[PDB]
Paper text:
Flavin-dependent halogenases regioselectively introduce halide substituents into electron-rich substrates under mild reaction conditions. FDHs depend on reduced flavin adenine dinucleotide (FADH2) as a cofactor, which is bound by a dedicated subdomain. As a first reaction step, FAD-C4a-OOH is formed, which subsequently oxidizes the halide ion, resulting in the formation of hypohalous acid (HOX).
Xcc4156 and BrvH have short loops in both positions, resulting in a more open substrate-binding site compared with Trp halogenases and a solvent-accessible catalytic lysine residue. Like BrvH, Xcc4156 does not halogenate free tryptophan; these enzymes do, however, show activity towards free indole and indole derivatives. The FAD-binding loop (amino acids 47–56) of Xcc4156 does not have continuous electron density in chain B. Indeed, the loop is partly disordered in one chain of the apo structure and is fixed in an open conformation in the other chain. The FAD-binding loop, which changes its conformation between the apo and the FAD-bound form in related enzymes, is involved in a crystal contact in the apo Xcc4156 crystals. In apo Xcc4156, this site (Thr346 and Asn347) does not contain any bound halide. The asparagine in Xcc4156 is particularly interesting as its side chain occupies the position that would be taken up by the ribityl moiety of FAD in a FAD-bound halogenase, thus possibly hampering FAD binding. Thus, apo Xcc4156 crystals provide functional insight into FAD and bromide binding, even though neither the cofactor nor the halide is visible in the structure.
Numbering used by the authors:
A (entry chain B): 11 to 503
B (entry chain A): 6 to 510
The structure:
Amino acid sequence: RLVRRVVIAGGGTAGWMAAAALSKLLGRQLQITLVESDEIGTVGVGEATIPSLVTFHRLLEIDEAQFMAATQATFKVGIAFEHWRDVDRHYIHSFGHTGTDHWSAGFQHFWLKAHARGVARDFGDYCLELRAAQEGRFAHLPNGGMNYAYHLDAGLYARFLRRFSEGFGVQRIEGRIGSVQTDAHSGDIAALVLDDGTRIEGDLFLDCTGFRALLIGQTLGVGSEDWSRWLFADSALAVQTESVGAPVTFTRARADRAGWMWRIPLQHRVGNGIVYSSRYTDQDSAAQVLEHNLQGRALTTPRALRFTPNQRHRVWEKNCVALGLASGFLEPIESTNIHLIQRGIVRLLQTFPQVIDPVDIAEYNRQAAEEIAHIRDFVILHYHATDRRDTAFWRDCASMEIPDSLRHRMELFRQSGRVFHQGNELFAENSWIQVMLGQGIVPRHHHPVADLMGDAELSQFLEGIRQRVEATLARLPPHAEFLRRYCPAPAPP
Amino acid sequence: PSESQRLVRRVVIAGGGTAGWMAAAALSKLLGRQLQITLVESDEIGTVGVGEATIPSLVTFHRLLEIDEAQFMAATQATFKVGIAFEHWRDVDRHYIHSFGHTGTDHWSAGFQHFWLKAHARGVARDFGDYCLELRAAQEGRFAHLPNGGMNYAYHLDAGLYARFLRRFSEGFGVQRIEGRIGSVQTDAHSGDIAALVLDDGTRIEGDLFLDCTGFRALLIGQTLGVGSEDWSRWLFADSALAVQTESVGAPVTFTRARADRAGWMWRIPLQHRVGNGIVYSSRYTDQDSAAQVLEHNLQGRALTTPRALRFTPNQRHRVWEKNCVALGLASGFLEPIESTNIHLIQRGIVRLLQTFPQVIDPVDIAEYNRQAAEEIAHIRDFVILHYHATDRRDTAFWRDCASMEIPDSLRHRMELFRQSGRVFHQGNELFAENSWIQVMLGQGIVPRHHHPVADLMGDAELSQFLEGIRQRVEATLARLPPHAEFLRRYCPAPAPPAPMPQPA
């Protein structure tokens, strides 16, 4: 049966990112219908992103400045990780690349040798994007020389994508789903039945219904793998504050006693939140910690969220593809939520069915499983690589068993300073290095190629890199000045 | 134990030839100022006049080593290679080319083959090969470099001359060559590590890290350390070859020929002043005398050598790095030369070693090395199996068995993906690109039942205009390339041997 009708269950970022991409590419031959309820809204929730979204908008021919102005967006070049290695020990995990590699050995080997010889500055001084986070500067550079992403209002983003999608013929139906129907012989989803009795028939259904996974889970019975043995957070509180100064170019991830706090700058507001574990603390205490750390007064009543670190066992089952929370969830410590939605959509478009076949489904599921396990391991790394023993939460994080896949990467770096990137893993070599060095893993050896340079040659190699970083950084304007010239957003009412 | 005693300062390479001298060359180039590197080889071991085909990774190897391409080619009687002509694989008298490069133009949502498949269903497609420049250069016998690596290519070379060229390079970076035969291998009583080699004259060569380049003898990784190998003969039946050089009968073509027969296949490889030939076959399906007759029947020109008989078996060493020993080349495994992977697998073992080169040897480094090696070779294994399993042939028991055998699940999934939806993917550092999977599966008769629906957006005129614009760009580029022989004469002319010995007909 030819796939001619796609029904998207749920709106928000997952549903409207899917509608936007599907209608842009295939909307001239597909009937695309999205069902969502006006009773759900996310406007005024700030969210951080990663550079894959730049590519997504290139594929969709979305104008960056128009998108940013419509979503109150600012630029992002990294995440400032405060108090993770230990209290008062901070580092930045930035985009980009540090230093110059040799074909046999990455830059970190030269930096490690130089540091042992006392001729190295901080590892981050050799990375432009990291310095741009420290100094609050941003502009685009020729030939994609600046690696960046965005801080955005997720509700305004969904609204922008809705306008885009409706322009490519997406049919929006306002309502709630009262029943999901299956086919008696195949087990496929046949239709959704709305709360007014309307049956919406389709060939392929996207489950964007959130954490309940109404289609792939409650209807088709696909369970999820629970990761709470490794990842203890299960709660969040979020609140916006007034801006108190020019927008920084980084997201802040500030560890506390039993969780951590995000701070995300938008053009005229700041998004804040605390992520914590209900098995170690309670909502009242977390609200107190969040309030204590806010700059400026809160503008909204805090919004509470409950979640589980998890992954749907298969993200494509029969004629249903899950996206967003219905496919899984990891806390926003590395800003991966919108990325995982995008990956599910782009992979679906690259495997789009003429007819649906098990071999396509199996390949899709294999890729999704591999990609998410890699991101999970990197999230676990943030909690497990810590010197902190000051609360039960941190002692438990440091002492837990971890996936063998993560243990092997940590051991490789600890022994020989080596990191290796595979396939379509999200996190690049630079990310593994910045985070492991930043959180206190010290390689016992470095690559022998770095020992070929004497002290003066090695010091000059590093210093040349650092001078080029500083010379480039000096040409970049303050963030707020660039925003004003490139993508000024209207002041909220 | 002593920690300082763990530092790797002395590297001993057991065996010469391609494996040993490629290893010596790369290791001495990069680390010869810090390591004492010794290579042990016997003058009684080795064969003169082996012609071998390669793949584009060797171009990168020479860039890493700063080996000049024209000097290397002139020194090894080398010619250029843009692909392999596969004759009689899909069926008797049905041929195709597996080239380097990429066919057509992709969309971000769908590879070129989906547009070609739609065009074929609409009757507006030419042969798939017409949309690939390297393939057309194979058909027309043309070659030159193009700006920004616009031509993808590798080499046909004399392997013995290549090893001698690398020996000269290596000695220049300080490698110490010791001629002789290894009489025994000494191990450490407590660790089992290799401690030294002892030659037949009593010479003791100590080292910290040992590279086993001894071939099927596997003196270190096999005979000493006892690492077994995985048997792949349930999927791959060839175990024998006969090889012979012939005089050139014309200008050198730009492709390696892989011509299937009843129970094996034959290679034909052009060098600047001779041609390499061989038949690869299964002793379980035919005998040497019959294989010799088939080879003789297909030869062009007089033979320049007496045919040499070879034995082998498809396999991978269970671990290629064991304790302080790294196996390379035949000691690490073997696949038949159907996709010209022998020298590539040596290079990968060397490059991977240099990228994880030990200050001290540690199990986590060994484990990572072995994992990468195992994943890479299994992927190449599957592609070799694909050549035998994807066939219409039922005309001999050999082909019926190849078509009906069980295959690895990893290969079955790739074949089913293409058969159902025309889809291919490339993962990690797998050798074979999407273009390779597509050309070989289409060429050997896997017919996609569906294609990506994005191609259904194009009407016939738009689709034909898309394909014809690609074909016109291929043909305009091809018309600017000279005949292979003219390019060789100007770029890398090798001296003609003075006294070849053609045998009377």
